Amino acid sequence: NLAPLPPHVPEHLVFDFDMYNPSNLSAGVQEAWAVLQESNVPDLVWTRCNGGHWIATRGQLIREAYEDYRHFSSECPFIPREYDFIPTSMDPPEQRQFRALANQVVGMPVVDKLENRIQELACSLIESLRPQGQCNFTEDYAEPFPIRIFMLLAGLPEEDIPHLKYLTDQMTRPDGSMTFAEAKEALYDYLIPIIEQRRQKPGTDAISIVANGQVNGRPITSDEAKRMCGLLLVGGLDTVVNFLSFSMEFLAKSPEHRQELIERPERIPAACEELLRRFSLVADGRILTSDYEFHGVQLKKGDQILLPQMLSGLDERENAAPMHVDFSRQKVSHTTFGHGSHLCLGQHLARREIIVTLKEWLTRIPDFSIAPGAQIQHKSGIVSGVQALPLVWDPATTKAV
Ligand code: HEM
Numbered sequence: 001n002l003a004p005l006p007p008h009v010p011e012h013l014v015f016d017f018d019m020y021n022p023s024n025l026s027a028g029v030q031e032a033w034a035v036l037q038e039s040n041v042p043d044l045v046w047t048r049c050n051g052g053h054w055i056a057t058r059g060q061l062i063r064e065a066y067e068d069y070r071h072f073s074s075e076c077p078f079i080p081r082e083y084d085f086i087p088t089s090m091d092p093p094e095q096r097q098f099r100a101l102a103n104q105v106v107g108m109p110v111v112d113k114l115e116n117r118i119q120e121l122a123c124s125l126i127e128s129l130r131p132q133g134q135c136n137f138t139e140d141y142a143e144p145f146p147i148r149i150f151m152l153l154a155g156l157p158e159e160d161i162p163h164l165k166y167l168t169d170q171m172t173r174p175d176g177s178m179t180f181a182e183a184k185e186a187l188y189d190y191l192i193p194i195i196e197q198r199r200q201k202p203g204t205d206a207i208s209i210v211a212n213g214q215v216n217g218r219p220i221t222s223d224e225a226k227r228m229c230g231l232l233l234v235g236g237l238d239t240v241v242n243f244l245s246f247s248m249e250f251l252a253k254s255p256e257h258r259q260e261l262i263e264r265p266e267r268i269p270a271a272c273e274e275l276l277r278r279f280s281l282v283a284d285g286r287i288l289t290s291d292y293e294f295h296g297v298q299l300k301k302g303d304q305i306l307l308p309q310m311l312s313g314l315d316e317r318e319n320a321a322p323m324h325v326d327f328s329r330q331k332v333s334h335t336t337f338g339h340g341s342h343l344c345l346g347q348h349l350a351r352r353e354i355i356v357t358l359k360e361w362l363t364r365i366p367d368f369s370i371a372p373g374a375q376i377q378h379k380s381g382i383v384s385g386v387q388a389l390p391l392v393w394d395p396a397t398t399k400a401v
Pocket residue numbers: 077086087088089099102106231232233235236237239240243281282284285309336337338339341342343344345346347349350
């Protein structure tokens with residue numbers, strides 16, 4: 001599965017890293033990707049895996065490339081080359097209109113509005129789990145929490161959750177029932193009638209807002225609205241599900257860090273930021289719009305380049321002892337939510353989900369562990385993650401509140 005080396009790529013830059021199967025995976029995903037930052041590895045390498053593509057390995061180049069959309073286009077953001085969500089695949093200027101609209105639905109003011117709804121949802125999930133003394137965290141909290149948040153955001157009935165969870169799962173873990181493109185249309189078929197109706201009788205919900213939106217001085221098309229609404233759903237799922245899982249896996253394994261946040265709950269927002277750095281999980285890419293010499297390396301029009309958001313915060317040049325989790329770091333440097341014009345619109349909503357999760361969980365279930373005998377398995381990709389997270393606790397050490 002190595003693609004033949006293109007003639008413009010010098011051999012000395014070749015490191016065959018497989019973003020879907022890194023060799024050090026059993027050590028943890030972030031550790032597995034950090035091999036790219038060992039001192040014998042150049043700032044910019046070519047891998048022959050996954051069709052062949054560049055990888056920027058250090059924070060400086062990752063940031064620079066994300067800033068320079070004129071050379072590094074979002075028209076093809078996934079490796080391999082072989083997905084019509086908006087605004088993911090748009091560059092400025094087209095991107096800014098759609099981004100402005102989506103910001104109306106998940107922006108800081110909306111997050112401030114839903115804050116206690118978000119807390120009530122977390123409390124309800126946690127309280128239902130608390131007496132069991134155990135859960136499949138990824139299944140029982142990490143997924144229900146953001147999907148329930150979406151149903152609130154989008155004004156959608158609870159009965160639709162199982163079917164919506166299934167459709168979104170088909171894009172990450174397919175059953176074999178249908179192609180990826182079929183899962184997409186199924187989702188769109190769910191969304192179109194809701195969009196069309198709320199054009200006519202708008203609510204205060206995200207679908208209403210997007211549906212009644214304007215681009216190019218005219219009403220948004222149903223095609224545009226469906227592709228945007230689709231991103232608002234999937235965008236806040238896989239990342240959140242997997243990030244909360246990494247964070248809870250770490251806390252389950254580190255009673256000292258649990259204790260710190262229990263004793264000092266005011267450090268939880270700072271803890272959130274440090275977890276976002278240490279357990280960063282996205283690795284998107286760009287495509288070269290033209291021939292371009294970049295830090296002494298000749299890139300060719302059409303080359304793909306993976307720019308792992310994950311790696312900037314792990315780079316020792318950005319944070320000392322980057323593998324060490326320290327909630328009091330004076331400066332937490334990362335690009336966990338990206339960088340440049342596509343920087344996560346959900347960043348404020350995600351931080352609140354994380355903070356609320358940490359606070360409510362540590363309040364009700366302060367002492368918890370990985371299930372005895374369980375070895376946590378991870379997966380690597382565009383959004384890296386946790387396959388499952390079995391947790392246990394003693395319900396006599398918990399409290400309802
Ligand atoms: C831990 C949680 C999250 C992480 C790590 C994360 C990460 C990212 C990253 C790296 C990007 C930019 C991708 C690129 O430049 O190619 C992005 C974009 C985006 N995210 Fe998130 N995200 C998270 C949560 C959310 C949530 C909760 C939502 C709510 C729906 C959301 C909605 C979006 C949207 C709409 C974009 C597209 C922005 C654009 O293309 O202009 N994200 N996210």
